[PDB]
Amino acid sequence: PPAQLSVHTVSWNSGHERAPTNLEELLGLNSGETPDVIAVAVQGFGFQTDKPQQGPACVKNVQSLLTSKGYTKLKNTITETMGLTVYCLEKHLDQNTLKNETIIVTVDDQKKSGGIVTSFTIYNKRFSFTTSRMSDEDVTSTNTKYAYDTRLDYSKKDDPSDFLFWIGDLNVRVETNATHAKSLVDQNNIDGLMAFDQLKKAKEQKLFDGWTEPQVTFKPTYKFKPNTDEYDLSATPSWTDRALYKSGTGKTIQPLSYNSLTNYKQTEHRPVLAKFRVTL
Ligand code: HEM
Numbered sequence: 001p002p003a004q005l006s007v008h009t010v011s012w013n014s015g016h017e018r019a020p021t022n023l024e025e026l027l028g029l030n031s032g033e034t035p036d037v038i039a040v041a042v043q044g045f046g047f048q049t050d051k052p053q054q055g056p057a058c059v060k061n062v063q064s065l066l067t068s069k070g071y072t073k074l075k076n077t078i079t080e081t082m083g084l085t086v087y088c089l090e091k092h093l094d095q096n097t098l099k100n101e102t103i104i105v106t107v108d109d110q111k112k113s114g115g116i117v118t119s120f121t122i123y124n125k126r127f128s129f130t131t132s133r134m135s136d137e138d139v140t141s142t143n144t145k146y147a148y149d150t151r152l153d154y155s156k157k158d159d160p161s162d163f164l165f166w167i168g169d170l171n172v173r174v175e176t177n178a179t180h181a182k183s184l185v186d187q188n189n190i191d192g193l194m195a196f197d198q199l200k201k202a203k204e205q206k207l208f209d210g211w212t213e214p215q216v217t218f219k220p221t222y223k224f225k226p227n228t229d230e231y232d233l234s235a236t237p238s239w240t241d242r243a244l245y246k247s248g249t250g251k252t253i254q255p256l257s258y259n260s261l262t263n264y265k266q267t268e269h270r271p272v273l274a275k276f277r278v279t280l
Contacts (some may be wrong), residue, residue: 012042040083041068073087083197116131162246174238222238222268
């Protein structure tokens with residue numbers, strides 16, 4: 001049993017955009033790293049029905065690339081608005097302790113808002129990965145617009161997971177006007193602008209309680225003119241895709257890297273890649 005494992009996560013609010021065919025940068029593999037687990041989350045429109053017939057490319061191109069490196073797909077789950085896939089190096093899996101389970105939670109009668117949780121055990125430690133999606137206009141268990149529900153939080157279980165990650169657009173925004181936000185971006189005052197970000201507000205309301213974000217040094221990932229590095233100032237520049245971590249059992253989780261991937265410019269949000277090292 002190793003002392004430590006590495007975890008890469010990436011999430012993208014990708015909308016109606018197809019998967020890119022260049023996936024190595026997106027998963028954080030392009031400097032030759034071989035992380036122990038990889039989780040990929042999206043938010044957008046149409047995945048499950050898959051009118052665009054994109055599914056096979058996603059499968060063919062990912063299943064392609066990760067299999068050489070010795071990964072196994074534990075689970076892919078899709079809905080009409082969300083997607084979550086988790087992979088683990090084959091070498092770590094004991095099939096009769098793994099207890100591979102996924103739930104889906106739905107908050108509205110159209111099943112457009114809610115979340116997904118995929119959990120599994122290796123070396124007698126339990127991992128849980130969550131993504132979630134909320135609209136600004138819905139009525140919720142929380143009476144907020146933030147993409148939190150206690151049913152997706154495996155730290156609020158009688159038996160909480162050892163390592164927990166929550167990845168996606170949490171519907172947390174920057175609560176100031178665009179002029180001021182754009183001024184702070186141009187000054188590279190990232191912490192100054194973070195002062196207006198809604199995650200702390202969500203936590204004051206006991207949402208995402210005890211969940212930690214790695215330090216943010218990148219500029220807002222939204223809202224861009226597609227194919228440029230130019231903000232569309234019709235919205236206040238915000239941090240949309242986020243990675244949060246927690247342990248339910250006093251285990252150390254150390255972020256290594258937390259970055260937006262500006263080379264993926266196809267849409268209005270830029271994907272966010274986090275790398276962690278966990279101590280079992
Ligand atoms: C219009 C947009 C998209 C549609 C309609 C769509 C549809 C799907 C469907 C139906 C699957 C599962 C099919 C199966 O299991 O046979 C899938 C898998 C997946 N897609 Fe997408 N996709 C879209 C965009 C994206 C984007 C932007 C990403 C970003 C990376 C992505 C990443 C994935 C991943 C990782 C899988 C799992 C691949 C595997 O089997 O290992 N997709 N896609």
